[PDB]
Each structure stands twice: as structure tokens, then as C-alpha cells.
Design a protein around this ligand. Structure first.
Ligand SMILES: Cc1cc2nc3c(=O)[nH]c(=O)nc-3n(C[C@H](O)[C@H](O)[C@H](O)COP(=O)(O)OP(=O)(O)OC[C@H]3O[C@@H](n4cnc5c(N)ncnc54)[C@H](O)[C@@H]3O)c2cc1C
Ligand SMILES: Cc1cc2nc3c(=O)[nH]c(=O)nc-3n(C[C@H](O)[C@H](O)[C@H](O)COP(=O)(O)OP(=O)(O)OC[C@H]3O[C@@H](n4cnc5c(N)ncnc54)[C@H](O)[C@@H]3O)c2cc1C
Ligand code: MET
Ligand code: MET
Lengths: 684, 684
């Protein structure tokens, strides 16, 4: 039941509604332009040219094409990253980034004839990521081919935790080297306890609406559900799940599930010899390293159960590639499509400038101010009708948090501590303006943004001949070499990905893709930050040798007399010397890879997700919207950035229409009215 | 009531027992040598010359002095840090480190006449840290003066969160600028809920033995508790607390407490406009930035409630300085005292070598093997009777996890991925040998160690004239300048500490002391890792300007209508150009600052804490002990390192006596027998 084209994936997920936005299918809302604007010549800024900002630009283009003769939209897009595709009309990165969609091209002097691509950020896309595939269809067409991402379990995989080794494909014991594996048994216990059954008895530990999550996922994905059922999920049942479980970590939930299974006898004592608590702990940690289909979630054990449950409902692990050589092409293509679809009514200019501050000021028609610095640190100020702040939360904080929380007669804004020039604004209000009369409302949005959790992440890459997989010491599953390795060696998750520039001579050896503490533990060895090599011609050889050295472990396989050094050490050492690489998102200006919510974080992230509803408060007249995966319930997915972009543009339309929701299309209106408003007073 | 000398502190905490070791006061155990050894000439290694390793050395010296004529102990102490005090027998660090006890001396060319000291690691010591003050008396005498550490609230303090500003000293509202402050109300709610009352009614939300923690704290600190009370805590009531609450984060607990208080009306809606969950979240986040006496615990919100409760029971925030110019002096003095107390029966040699591997091997008497590399990267192998591994968990992992989990005929150990020379060992068993028959048992200890959580931390320092505090632009409160700033600016916690080289002309401006995500958010700006400057003659000016710039915020105060840039911006910018500094523990080889347990981590950390009980199994030939704050229930405190060292030496005594617990002193026996054993052996 594997999808083979963009269109097949698109249609698969077209219906799916996430539990915090259960009254709308975002793909359906995005099918037609989101609404209508009054006649005018608008001046809009988008800060950030990543997935969020470019999707927002695309939707603005669609709106622009609907405007009457004499009307139009001008967009200034600010993009600070010198490597952005926006500024481009051995390891090469220049022109190959669109924020956290980021490719590194490995070549030997001629970039048009490369060896492989490292996908440094986004790489694998859920089947039911309906908005993702909607935009992929706009970019590439429905007919374009897609492939199954080679996740652990999708290709032959070796798993190592402590003394346990497994070699497997999927979850059918017939496809496991050891069909009696305790790993496969604990997977069944934890999946049963978290997901349960779509039919029959409820067996999950943490019900939603008194039933297993699998049953709720089928309603959220229904090709037609009760409207009433969706409303009750939105307003009652998902909120009640949050109230109960937002304070429970994933790690705690796994331990509860394993404890009950152990007490029932479904899981036996480990070795026959560990005591009760040691056995439970062993299983918790074993599952921790194994995961849900994308490698161990041990490093993610501090996320709320609520956050994990979003991913469960979404069947997140069932993922595909894009029909591209480099994922940045998706975003580049959407940028071009935006301009095409505006039909001449959208004009776009790119600024290679870092925004330092946003505010509302003055008494002119355009009051939405941006203060920015160019690549030689010259200051620039511009006023706009509307602004979309399409940057993740730690990048947004300095822009929105340094102006205070209420009216100020005058402020000299900018990066004065850097020695840079400031600019005087008069009659100043915060950019994220939730009240004329509460500094606390203005402070709540800013403080929430600034305390969202950016998960840490890093990727270590090298280039290897694909034929290295045919060495006699590389294990096989039914004649196919092992191509994914999930391990407690410190590397966490490793992938031998065939080059997309093509059977390819080379593969991208994703030696280590780490999250959270797994990333922290490596970071001292990266050498140069955020990228080693920092130059096009260097190689991160010393760093990479420390990764090879982590793999230099004696591994015992069942039936063998003695342990020998792990074969995967030999595989890593087969990578060529040149083009060894690490990128540390943690030491990038993003301050990490992507948002993941901790216990208690729902209320912070959800405030951000609902922020665009400020447009309902007509007199407030707030001109700023936010658009990033940080302002979604899908941090770490293009789907989240795209949802947030859709929210931002929907809100912008309502604000341009002075609070009138009838300006949104029928299908888009629930983007605004299906959420609890962020402004209680005034109503609207 | 305030302790004024080492002896007064020592005596204050002499009886205190931690809840995971409730049967024993470690200082009482340590009052005499821990036990006796058979006659012999012992060859022992200590890996690591930090607080754990040196306290272990001291206790081995105490033991050595008791040996008869012709007997003795030889210790090889391995210390890889080139800046260790052990290898020394503008910003200078050479010779000023004892692991995470780490000083930076600021001077102008003559290091004998410095300006100030930056305490880069340990700096503030709880009054009831009884073992810390026990060793401080060994090093300095009881008469040595100590000072109250200038924590937020101990000195005039400014607190900033969102739109909220407070200026205060203490918890008496008479000395808050706003006695009606919401910050003081939430603090009182969160204290009632977590700590409760030492007398009368129980009001706390999370009881221990059905009573408030404050009541249990008193029992744990009592010279003579009631009969059976400590046993019941140890075996019943504290285990039951863990079973209930080890799956609950601190942040979740705070929100539960706040929710109940908001529903009761103790905490009002924040604005005329914040809804229920918004007001609740505001108070949770307000308290999160304020803290318990040492700055905001928001970054620590993912710790288990169990871990916070340990700190509550210990009154952890009531802290002092040591009687030194640099805290490294404490560890240096202890090292010299170890040699003195050995009475010529302890011989110590220091090796400037990095240990790469430990194992048991061969057939000779001394079977505990260490493989190391010197400063020329030449390999060394040495065999010992016993080894104490006195390094934190991420540094221990490569040493103990790469030899598998059962017998191997031979292994070529070492850092082969680095291209370094290996050494062949024959008849090899893992170093952390919990079982002769169960790889899973051996895997549980290794995998536990490798998955402990090392909290991230960083410190930004500069040098400022103390007289800067007397400028009209620095606020005064209750007769003194503000000297502590706790803020949501990104800096987290800031201190203006008078120089200890002396009123002093200079102060150490600890501009930012961050934990966890607060540290992550800054890390991209550090420039050089782990230390900027990397040289003695440089200054981290560019880095520091990014911190000054985070302080360039317009702050509205009650006392002035026109908000201005935060005064603290001016103070930070008053620091001199030279000697600006950051140290990032996260990018140090420790991979962070210190252990803090997440939900579920009790089972891992407590396994480590109990590991030395392997000595009870006489048939098990395990020569290795561990000694670090990572293997304690006080990660982030010298007390934890010292407790773990006491455990290690107690276990070593029992192992050297082939399982005979009677070889421990009466007072030290419970260090082994008061814990659940990690190996099953017969009763009594
Ligand atoms: C390691 C990693 C793995 C991932 N895995 C997947 C995956 O497999 N599948 C998936 O769907 N998603 C994945 N993601 C998530 C995906 O990459 C993001 O959700 C998405 O790219 C974020 O888009 P955004 O617009 O929110 O932010 P960003 O991509 O961060 O874009 C923001 C843009 O704003 C610019 N900018 C920032 N601050 C300023 C400023 N002050 N002035 C001007 N310009 C500024 C930046 O330079 C950047 O181009 C992954 C990401 C990472 C890092
Ligand atoms: C930012 C920070 C703040 C802190 N605040 C306080 C505080 O105010 N009060 C308090 O009581 N405590 C505090 N602590 C905690 C205190 O510093 C530690 O508990 C204690 O110093 C840890 O001692 P240790 O022996 O466990 O480990 P370490 O200090 O880490 O010492 C281990 C030693 O082993 C060496 N080593 C490591 N690996 C090898 C190897 N392979 N071969 C050879 N040598 C090796 C290291 O170089 C090091 O010298 C703080 C620590 C930090 C970092
Ligand atoms: C949020 S899940 C982790 C990040 C990313 N979506 C991945 O699959 O790697
Ligand atoms: C564990 S609490 C945090 C580290 C250290 N004890 C401090 O007081 O800063």
C-alpha cells in the first residue's frame, strides 16, 4: 500500500486533521486562495526565506492574483543566511539552503558533476503530511515519483543496545533474525500500550475519548466524520487528554506501560536474573534505543506524552522522499511558483539583511516597522502594512522582546551592544500586540516564545562507495546489505543513503544523526561550529575519527564464540578521507534543530499556534503574524512550518479586512474560527 | 544562626542523611578510617584527579596509615587535564583546575598580584553539605572563616520576567519594593506546596510518609532520630515517594500546585484579560524564572520531582564560600593531606595520561587493566589490584563500554578509530563486572552510565571595578547596590562578586550563569569552545558584546514613566575590555556541567550509586569502583562526588577482604549494607 507518486501521498493525507486543529483539514483549506483582500497596493514584509516564509509568499501570490486592476502586493523578503538559495539567483553549501532544508553537495571541482548530497536538515516526509504533499504537488506535480525513506526497519537494519543485537526488517517476526527477540516483544507491548487497536477491545493505557488512540486517528483521517465528533475532539476530548497528560513525559509513560506488562507476565525477567526493577528498567531503555520507526526515542523521552501522541495519531514514521536531487529544490520551486501565480500582481524583492527589531510605531498608514542590518552592518529601517515573522523562536526572541510590553513615547532600537547603529522610533508599541491595555498579554506571548524548547540535533556525514556495502563483513538480510544501524554506541542512528545524483557509485554515509543528549554527548568532538569543515575544501577528519572510534566496540553475535570489533567500525572507516562533515544545528543561529514540547509546554506552543487569531480583534490593529514550525504542533516537520504559514496568511487576510472572517473562503475560515481566540477582549 | 567558620558549617550538617542513604550520615562514617585491609602491598589506580578521585585518595591514605610494617598502598593517579593542579607541582587557568573545581586568574602580567578570580565551576556550598565541610576541615581547619554566598535574595537583587520587575532582599515582604508582588505570592504558593510546614498541619502537595517534606528533613538531620525512622524512610517511605513521583517533572509539579492555588483564589487572574490556563501558565513561568534561592529553575523543569525533593530536604540554597582565594585550593590541600595522613605507607605517582580502556584480564594477581595514552599519544598498559574510576559518566563511557559484556578470548583495546596503538588483552572480562553469568547484568550498569543526563552549563565572566556599583545609574536597595540579577533576557543569572584577592578594587562580573536550554540558546555566540579566549592574552570581546546586547532591552519600572534601556546593560558595558571570558562545560570533555536526573533516571543513577555493593559477592572477581557526582544523588555538588568516593573506598575494603563486611568500621558498614545490593548474596 506504498505510495509511489506525489499525488498518491497527497491524496492519502488530504483529510487528516491534527488534534489541536481538528475542525480543519489544512490541505482542504489550501486548495483555493485563502480569501480576499480589499483593493489596494499593499507593502508586506516576510522575515525569513525558509519553508514558512516561502509558503506564506506563495499564498500571498495566490491572493495577489485575485486583486483587481490597479491593485497589487509588494513583498520584501529578508533573508540573513548568506547560503540561502535566495541569494544565488569539496563540499558546497552556498545557494543550497532554505533555512533548515539544507543540502551539502559533495564534488571534486565541478559542482554540476557531484558525487552525493548530504541532507543536513529535513529529509523524510510522512505519507499523511497532507499540506507538505499539497505544496509538493504545486512544486512538482502529482505524477512526480517518490521513494520510501530508508528508515530503520524499512531497509535491513542492525540494532544494538547493551548486550542485545537484532537484525530485522519491519515488525513481522518472520523478518527478524531472532523471531523470539525481546526487542520485538517490548515493541509490541509499548505500541499496544500507546497506540492500541483500531478495532475491537481497547488495550491502550492512555485513552482519548475513552478509546484507543488508533480509533481516534481513524476519525481524524476520515474520508467523511461526524462534524460532531471532530468538535468534541477539538473542544472536549483532546483538551481533556492534555489536562491529564501534559505533565507526563514519554519516558514516564513507557515505564508505566512496561511495569504493567511485566506485572502481568507479558514481559519476562531479563536473563532470567535481573530483579523486577532492573528488568523493567532494561526494557524501558531497550525500547528507548529501538524506537517507533525512526530510531531510538530515548533522547526524546522528556517530551510530553501529548507531543508523542500527536505523532502516533499521524502515523508519523511512514515516510517518503521528495522528487529531487536536493530537498532545497522544493523550496526554490515554491518561491518561483509564488511569483508565477501572482500573475504580475505580486512583486518580490530579496534583502540580504538580518532583522534586529520589529515594532509598531508612528502615525502613518504603514506602522509595522523592521530594523535590519546588511552584510556590512549598515542599518536599515522600513515600514510595512503587514509583516510575517517567519523565523523560529530563538531567532524571533531578539526581534520581539527588547521593546517592552506597552506604549513608549520613543525608543532607540537596534543592536547597541554590538556597537551597531540604533534607530529612533516614536509612539512605539510591541510587534506581537495582543493588547492596547494589558502589558501582561503582550508579555505572555513574548515570554512563551522565548521559553519554547528547541531540540538539539547534529548530523555527521561522509562519502562512501556504495560497493563498500558488498564487503564480506557487511551483514546481509535475504541477500540485501544492512543500510540502517540504530545503536547505543553514541552514534544513535546511522544511514547509508544512495546518492541521489544518478545504482550510484557513492552513498551519503549519515554516520550519526543525533537528538538532545545524544547530540550533547558528541558536541565536544566537532572541532568547528556549526560546520566542520567551515570551508568548501576542508575535511572534518579528526572529528570523524572520533565517531569511527565510538564504533570500535567488541560486539557479540549469537552463536559466535567470541566478540570482534563491530563491523560497522569497518564500514565507517571505508568512507573516503575528503568530505568528512558535521553540522551542529545546536550551534547554528537557530540554537537547535526544531521545537519539541516538554511537559507543560503545550500552553506555550498552543498560544503561538493560535496567535494569528488576534486578527479577530478589530480595533487592536496588530500587523504582525508568525510563521514557523516553532509556532505549530508539528515542530520538526515541514508540515508544522506550512501550517503556521497558512495560519499567518489567514490571519493577515482577516486583519486586512478589519476583523471580518467572511473574507476568508468557506474552506479556510476554520483556520481562524476553529481555534480558541487569543484575545478574549475584545470579542469577534 | 549564620555559620561563620568551617567548623560551624561542619557541625551544622554532621548528622544529615540523604533519603537514598538514610541509614547513614556520611560525615559520621568518615570520622575514622573506613575499615581495615589485610597486610599486603596494594597497587591501586585512581582515574581522575577531581574531587572524587582526591577524596578517594585521602581515604586510602587513612587506610594506609593503619597497615603494618612492610605493607603499603601505591596509587597511580591518572589525570588527562593539562591544566590540573596535579601537573603544576590576562587570564591564567594552568594549574588552577581540579576537574570541575576550576579557577581562572585575572592578572596584568604578574600572576602573583592578580585582580580577581572567576570560579568557572563549583562556587557555592550548602550549610548542610556535611561531607564537604568535613573535608574542608581536613584541608583548612575548623577555625577558617567562611562567608554567605551572595545568591539572589542574599544581597539586593533585581528580578525580571516579562513585564514583571522586582527588587528585593530576603523573603520578608517588608524588604520587597512591592510587598504585593505576584512573585512573592507565587513563591509562597510553591513553597507551601512543595516544602510545607515543619510543625503543625501538613499542607504540602507531595507528602513523604504522609507528612510534609519539611518534617522529614528534620528527622534526616536529627542527631538521634526515633528508633526505626531512618530504616522506614530508607526501605519504605522514600521508595514509595519515588514509585509515585519519579515520573513527574518539576515543571509539572509546579503547574499542579499553581492550578490548585488558582482554583482556590489564592492566585488571581493575571489580567483583566488572561484566561485560566494563560494565568496559570504565567504564574508557572514567573516562578520558573524566580527560583528557590539560586536563580530560576525553569531551565531545570524537566528534572524529576524526586531530584528536586532531594534538594528541598537538604535546604540546598543556604550556601557559603570556602576559606580560599580559589576553590581549587581545597582539592590541592586535600591531595597534600592525603599524602600526609598516609604516614609514609601511601605512595602516589601522577600520570599525565588519558585512560582509554579498563578491563579485567589475564591470570596474574593484579588483573584490573588500564590502557592509557600520554601527551605524545604513546600507549601504556598497567595492571592493578583495584581501580577507582573517578570520572563523570560521559568520560567513563568509552573506558567501560567498548569491551562487550562477557568473557572474550582476546581483545585489541584502545583508540583504534583515532589511529592510536592498541594493546592485546587475553581472557578478558568487562571492567564493571556485575555477573559471571549474565551479559544483561553487565549491560545494565554500562547502559545506565551512558544514559545519565549531564546538564548543560556555561559561565560568561568579565572584570569590573567594584566602584561601578556606586554609580547613580546602579540601583540601590536597602542600603546597598544590586549585586544579583535574575532575568529572562537570556543571561539567566548574573552576579557581581567581589574579588577574593584582597574592599577589593575589582569584582568578577558573572554576567551569565546558565543551565540547560538557557545555555543552549547562547552557545552559538561563544566563538571558541570550550573556552574563549583559548589563550592567556586574548579577550572574548565579540562574544561578550552579544551578551551586553541581550541586555539592551527597554525596561519599564514603576519609578519612571519613560522606559529606558535596562541599567544592567550599562553595568555590563562597564566591564573592562580585557579579560572578557566564557567557559562552556557542554563543549568541555565532560559533555556538560553535572548530572541532573530526568523522570525515570532514578533507576539508572541509583544503580550507579549502589554499584559498590558488588563487593558483597565474594565469588565475583570485580576490582573496579566508581567515584563521581555522576554516581550519586547529588549531581552538581561536591557532596555527591565525595559521597561516591566514600562508597568506592568502602566497597574496595569489602572486596579486598573477600566479601567480609566486618572489615568496615561500625560506622562505615552501612555505606555498603544500608543499600539494596546490586548482586544477590545470602542474608547475614
Ligand atoms: C536536523 C533536522 C532534521 C529535520 N528532519 C525533518 C524531516 O525529515 N522532515 C520534515 O518534514 N522536517 C524535518 N525538519 C524540520 C524542517 O526542516 C523545518 O520544520 C522547516 O524547514 C522550518 O522552516 P521554518 O520556516 O519554520 O524555519 P527555518 O527553516 O529556520 O527558516 C527561517 C529562515 O529565516 C532566516 N532568518 C532567521 N532569523 C532572521 C533574521 N533575524 N533576519 C533575517 N532572516 C532571518 C533564516 O536564515 C532561515 O532561512 C528537520 C530539521 C532539522 C534541522
Ligand atoms: C558549572 C558548574 C557549577 C557547579 N556548581 C557547584 C557549586 O556551586 N557547589 C558544589 O558543591 N558543586 C558545584 N559543582 C559540582 C562540582 O564541581 C562537582 O560535583 C565536582 O567537582 C565533580 O568532581 P568529580 O570528581 O565527580 O568529577 P570531575 O571534577 O569531572 O573530575 C574528573 C577528573 O578526571 C579527569 N579525567 C576525565 N577523564 C579522564 C580520562 N579518561 N583519563 C584521565 N583523566 C581523566 C578530568 O580531567 C578531571 O580532572 C559545579 C560544577 C560545574 C561544572
Ligand atoms: C520531530 S521528530 C525528529 C525530527 C525529524 N522530523 C525527523 O524525523 O528526524
Ligand atoms: C545542581 S544545582 C546546579 C549546580 C550547582 N550546584 C549550583 O548551585 O549552581
Amino acid at each position: 500500500k506504498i505510495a509511489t507518486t506525489v499525488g498518491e501521498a497527497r491524496l492519502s493525507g488530504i483529510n487528516y486533521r491534527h488534534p489541536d486543529s481538528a475542525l480543519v483539514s489544512y490541505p482542504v483549506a489550501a486548495a483555493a486562495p485563502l480569501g480576499r483582500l480589499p483593493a489596494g497596493n499593499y507593502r508586506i514584509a516576510i522575515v525569513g526565506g525558509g519553508a514558512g516564509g516561502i509558503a506564506a509568499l506563495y499564498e500571498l501570490g495566490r491572493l495577489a492574483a485575485t486583486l483587481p486592476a490597479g491593485s497589487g502586493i509588494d513583498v520584501q523578503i529578508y533573508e540573513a543566511d548568506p547560503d540561502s538559495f535566495l541569494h544565488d539567483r569539496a563540499i558546497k553549501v552556498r545557494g543550497l539552503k532554505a533555512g533548515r532544508v539544507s543540502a551539502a553537495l559533495v564534488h571534486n571541482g565541478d559542482p554540476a558533476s557531484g558525487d552525493t548530497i548530504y541532507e543536513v536538515g529535513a529529509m523524510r516526509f510522512p505519507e499523511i503530511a497532507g499540506l507538505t504533499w499539497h505544496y509538493a504537488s504545486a512544486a512538482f506535480g502529482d505524477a512526480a515519483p517518490i521513494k520510501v525513506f530508508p528508515n530503520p526497519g524499512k531497509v535491513p537494519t542492525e540494532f544494538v543496545f547493551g548486550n542485545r543485537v537484532d537484525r530485522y526488517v519491519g515488525s513481522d517476526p518472520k523478518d527478524w533474525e531472532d523471531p523470539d527477540s525481546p526487542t520485538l516483544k517490548v515493541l509490541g507491548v509499548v505500541a499496544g500500550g500507546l497506540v492500541g487497536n483500531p478495532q475491537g477491545e481497547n488495550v491502550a493505557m492512555y485513552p482519548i475519548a475513552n478509546v484507543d488512540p488508533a480509533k481516534i486517528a481513524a476519525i481524524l483521517n476520515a474520508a467523511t466524520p461526524p462534524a460532531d465528533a471532530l468538535e468534541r475532539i477539538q473542544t472536549k476530548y483532546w483538551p481533556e487528554f492534555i489536562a491529564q497528560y501534559d505533565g507526563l513525559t514519554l519516558g514516564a509513560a513507557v515505564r508505566e506501560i512496561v511495569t504493567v506488562a511485566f506485572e502481568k507476565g507479558t514481559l519476562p525477567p531479563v536473563d532470567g536474573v535481573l530483579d523486577v526493577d532492573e528488568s523493567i528498567s532494561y526494557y524501558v531503555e531497550l525500547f528507548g534505543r529501538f524506537g517507533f520507526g525512526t530510531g531510538g526515542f530515548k533522547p526524546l523521552y522528556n517530551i510530553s506524552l501529548v507531543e508523542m501522541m500527536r505523532l502516533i495519531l499521524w502515523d508519523y514514521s511512514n515516510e517518503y522522499t521528495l522528487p529531487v536531487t536536493e530537498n532545497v529544490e522544493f523550496i526554490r520551486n515554491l518561491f518561483l511558483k509564488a511569483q508565477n501565480v501572482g500573475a504580475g500582481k505580486l512583486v518580490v524583492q530579496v534583502r540580504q539583511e538580518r532583522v534586529a527589531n520589529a515594532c509598531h510605531s508612528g502615525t502613518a498608514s504603514a506602522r509595522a516597522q523592521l530594523l535590519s542590518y546588511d552584510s556590512h552592518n549598515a542599518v536599515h529601517s522600513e515600514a510595512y502594512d503587514f509583516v510575517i515573522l517567519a523565523v523560529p523562536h530563538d531567532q524571533l526572541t531578539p526581534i520581539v522582546s527588547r521593546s517592552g510590553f506597552e506604549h513608549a513615547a520613543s525608543q532607540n532600537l537596534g543592536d547597541a551592544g554590538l556597537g551597531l547603529e540604533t534607530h529612533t522610533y516614536n509612539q512605539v508599541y510591541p510587534p506581537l500586540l495582543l493588547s492596547d491595555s494589558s502589558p501582561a498579554a503582550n508579555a505572555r506571548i513574548v515570554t512563551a516564545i522565548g521559553q519554547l524548547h528547541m531540540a538539539r540535533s547534529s548530523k555527521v556525514f561522509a562519502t562512501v562507495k556504495t560497493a563498500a556495502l558488498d564487503q564480506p563483513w557487511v551483514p546481509q538480510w535475504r541477500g540485501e546489505p544492512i543500510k540502517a544501524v540504530v545503536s547505543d554506541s553514541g552514534l544513535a542512528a546511522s544511514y547509508v543513503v544512495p546518492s541521489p545524483i544518478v545504482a550510484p557509485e557513492y552513498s551519503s554515509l549519515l554516520a550519526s544523526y543525533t537528538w538532545e543528549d545524544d547530540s550533547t554527548r558528541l558536541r565536544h568532538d566537532f572541532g568547528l561550529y556549526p560546520q566542520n569543515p567551515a570551508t568548501e575544501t576542508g575535511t572534518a577528519d579528526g572529528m570523524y575519527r572520533t565517531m569511527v572510534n565510538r564504533a570500535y566496540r567488541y560486539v557479540k553475535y549469537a552463536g559466535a564464540s567470541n566478540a570482534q570489533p563491530w563491523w560497522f567500525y569497518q564500514l565507517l572507516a571505508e568512507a573516503r578521507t575528503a568530505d568528512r562533515f558535521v553540522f551542529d544545528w545546536t550551534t547554528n543561529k537557530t540554537a537547535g534543530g526544531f521545537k519539541l514540547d516538554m511537559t507543560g509546554d503545550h500552553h506555550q506552543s498552543n498560544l503561538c499556534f493560535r496567535y494569528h487569531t488576534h486578527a479577530l480583534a478589530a480595533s487592536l490593529d496588530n500587523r504582525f503574524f508568525i510563521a514557523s514550525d516553532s509556532y505549530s504542533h508539528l515542530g520538526g516537520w515541514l508540515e508544522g512550518a506550512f501550517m503556521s504559514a497558512l495560519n499567518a496568511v489567514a490571519g493577515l487576510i482577516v486583519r486586512a479586512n478589519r476583523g471580518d472572517v467572511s473574507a476568508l473562503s468557506t474552506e479556510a475560515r476554520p483556520l481562524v474560527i476553529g481555534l480558541r481566540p487569543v484575545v478574549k477582549v475584545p470579542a469577534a
